[PDB]
């Protein structure tokens, strides 16, 4: 449920 779309991990 964590995503990396910018070269880092974020909650989404």
């Amino acid at each position, epitope marked *: *449920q*964590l*995503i*990396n*779309t*910018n*070269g*880092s*991990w974020h*909650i989404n």
Partner: antibody
Amino acid sequence: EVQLVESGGGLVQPGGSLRLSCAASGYTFTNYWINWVRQAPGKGLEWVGDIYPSDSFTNYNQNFKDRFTISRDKSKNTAYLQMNSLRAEDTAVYYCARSSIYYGKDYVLDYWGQGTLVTVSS
Amino acid sequence: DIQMTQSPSSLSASVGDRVTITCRASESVDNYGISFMNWFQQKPGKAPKLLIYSASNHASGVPSRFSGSGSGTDFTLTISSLQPEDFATYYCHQSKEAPYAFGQGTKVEIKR
């Protein structure tokens, strides 16, 4: 099922350019980052950079910026590695590998291509 | 930049031996309770194969003998019972923040 096939390697003259391709198949292409990793003969692995196929978001290894360009063609399921003004130093095996946009089972560098040898010689 | 150093750079061990490889990151690879440190095994003439991810997780199709541990800056890969097929260069890798990186690698050789 899932496979990454590198291409566009081989011999290249110093000062020349090469366009490497990573043909991806068997999965949703926009759901996995494509990473480029190089290995000089008899040396360690080097992260070159990566591309997010949906928006073409790209991350680079500071040493590869402005000479190496990672691009994509969503329609051809191919990520590209443009390498310009090549030096003997650049002689290496270039791999591509996928890494999930979502954290999960075997998310990180799950699948690799067989690699292509790039020889920068006159 | 998060960079890592592995220890030892090389080892020779016997079939059945417990082998321990360490990886030190220059900065913590922890985020959201996950330790973004992975382990790859590279056999000669082959692309590296995912063994361990997020410090302790097991990739599918990887033998039991391989296990991983650690948090923050210090990580360990252990081959519980060295098999002759285990000859390879073993790399730690960080997936926390770009630029991603690999350790220099540890060449595991089998002592006969």
